[PDB]
Amino acid sequence: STTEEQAKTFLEKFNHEAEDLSYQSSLASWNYNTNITDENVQKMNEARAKWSAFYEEQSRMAKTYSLEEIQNLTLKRQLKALQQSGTSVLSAEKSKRLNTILNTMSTIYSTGKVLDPNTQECLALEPGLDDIMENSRDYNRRLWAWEGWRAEVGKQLRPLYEEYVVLENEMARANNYEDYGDYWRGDYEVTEAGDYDYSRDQLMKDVENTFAEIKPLYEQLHAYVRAKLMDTYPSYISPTGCLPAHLLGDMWGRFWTNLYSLTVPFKHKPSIDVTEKMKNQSWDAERIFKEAEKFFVSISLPHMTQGFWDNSMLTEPGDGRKVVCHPTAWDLGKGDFRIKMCTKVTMDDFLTAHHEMGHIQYDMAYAAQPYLLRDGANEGFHEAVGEIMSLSAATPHYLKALGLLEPDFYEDNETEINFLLKQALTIVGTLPFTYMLEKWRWMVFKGEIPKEQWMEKWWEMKREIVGVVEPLPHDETYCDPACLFHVAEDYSFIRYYTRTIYQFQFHEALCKTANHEGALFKCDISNSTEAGQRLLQMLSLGKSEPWTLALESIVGIKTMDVKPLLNYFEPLFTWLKEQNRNSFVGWSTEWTPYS
Amino acid sequence: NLDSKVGGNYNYLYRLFRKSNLKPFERDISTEIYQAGSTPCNGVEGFNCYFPLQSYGFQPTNGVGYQPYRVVVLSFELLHAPATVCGPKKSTNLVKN
């Protein structure tokens, strides 16, 4: 008999077999240090080994099943997930040296151990690396920390990672794959499929078009941001001077929310609060979380289970019973879902509950599918849906639905705090980084030409595209491309290309269905009872359908588009033009970083 | 409530891999290895023959669909026998004169 029926027949068993061990893998993600440890870490570490070991036996016999001669992708998508070749192409001798590279930076790079004279300021996360910048602006950190951090990192991390770059890509050329990067987009690129022979053809020209209109507006924005930064330290922060990447609130300075504090436009202006209940009322977050669910199911989001309600907290007991601040989707399955996050009394964690507990509702939205198919259309779709409503949490328009304060309270039009601009700093500040970080790793894994140009070309476009000029040029002793938290640990950065755009595409659609164009940032998502009667079909489809068909119901497009970002900055830009007239747009090109 | 504990209750026996479907008012007790393929494996678990028996894992934290349920089917028949399995409970208090 043909293996076609046998292959599906094992899939019935395989679905049940996968579910049992997956529960064990996600049994505990915080039970490590909260109390004493009778046995905590090795409990699920072995379970993942058992699940991986059982997976290997399942995957190995799945190859005998007929992967080819399957003209329809309705069920072959479940076959391909298990029948992936994976790491099994390598030999035993090849596989032994791979783990040697993985543990190289696991210790020296994870914690910063660089000597400082008298220990004025050590280069480590302790004590309070990020918070010490918001109160102290010491000059020594601004120059000495640049040299010292990578001195103890690049000595050994540069040559060891060469083996994975070249030698581990021999099998990719065997399977026509360009690199591991093409392996990361295995689900995006589907060939030999009827009517769904879809590839990433836009990867030839996606890079150029989206950044054409960004640069003219990006140059204008940095002038206004740097304008308020002159009075902090004019000796180094000057219109001629440029701020290196380590001087933007982190050792790498990718997120620029730390820059808000020094750019306060009006210190004498009286300030109102989003909640305005710091009194004997004693506002409880769980009550508002219950009050926020109605908006979440206003767009037909399936109700998250009683596990969170049965077990949660409002005030920390301050005992061994504690939950560490780990934001992670609980893919427990079997009908079990529990939300246990840092439900403290903080305003910051209030806003993100839309991504903390409200984003979780997507897990069981496609629970009808098996465990393998219980996912979104792609990686970007899953992440971007949770960010649609997060930006309107601090809106006073959101408070009107709450009803805690006066429902008839006046809505001020003094929206001129840099808080509005601060939201753009994280979104647009890291856009040029993700823009050219992946381009460096695309051809470099191929290794078609030598490594005589890997370093100097790495430092070519970054000195003018983002306006960051390093005070000290880096050498082979500095593995700057391998000095990131993700390149060294082999994390797929290709998600950022799609996750960023689709969030505004998802968000603009909701504002389109809410008859609110123009002020995208002021999207009136409250009382959005008018959106649940159409978007309910998209939750059910899950991975059973291509993302191309699902995208028509919100924007009616087949590609990635940048229209929502244009109208985001227009209300801010009108007030931004008048205060930037003294300072020239942009920065000096190829200036001397030393001065 | 009374049939769930951590680790899963495996006492109940069910199968989801049988050569043919069942019939109305029919009971199947015998179990054979699910030899889906044409190649006989001589009744040894592996390729082309899967294990027929299976068991639900009934931990208490399972969802409502996974929650075990006890269902009773009350079948009624009339094979033209004088047998009766009912009886009235209506009797008003008697009065006199």
Ligand SMILES: *[C@@H]1O[C@H](CO)[C@@H](O[C@@H]2O[C@H](CO)[C@@H](O)[C@H](O)[C@H]2NC(C)=O)[C@H](O)[C@H]1NC(C)=O
């Ligand atoms: C959202 O819309 C609802 C009606 O669809 C309104 O809220 C109700 O308003 C009436 C008064 O007109 C009150 O009696 C109800 O108690 C309100 N219900 C709720 C759930 O608030 C109002 O237009 C909006 N509600 C807001 C902004 O809270």
Ligand SMILES: *[C@@H]1O[C@H](CO)[C@@H](O)[C@H](O)[C@H]1NC(C)=O
């Ligand atoms: C403290 O108590 C439990 C009891 O088993 C322990 O296993 C775990 O580490 C801690 N529980 C939580 C919820 O932190």
Ligand SMILES: *[C@@H]1O[C@H](CO)[C@@H](O)[C@H](O)[C@H]1NC(C)=O
């Ligand atoms: C086509 O779809 C059916 C639907 O169940 C699936 O079973 C089958 O594996 C798919 N591929 C074929 C028939 O090649």
Ligand SMILES: *[C@@H]1O[C@H](CO)[C@@H](O)[C@H](O)[C@H]1NC(C)=O
């Ligand atoms: C703020 O100004 C806008 C016009 O830009 C106006 O529509 C709104 O009513 C004003 N809000 C006030 C005065 O509270």
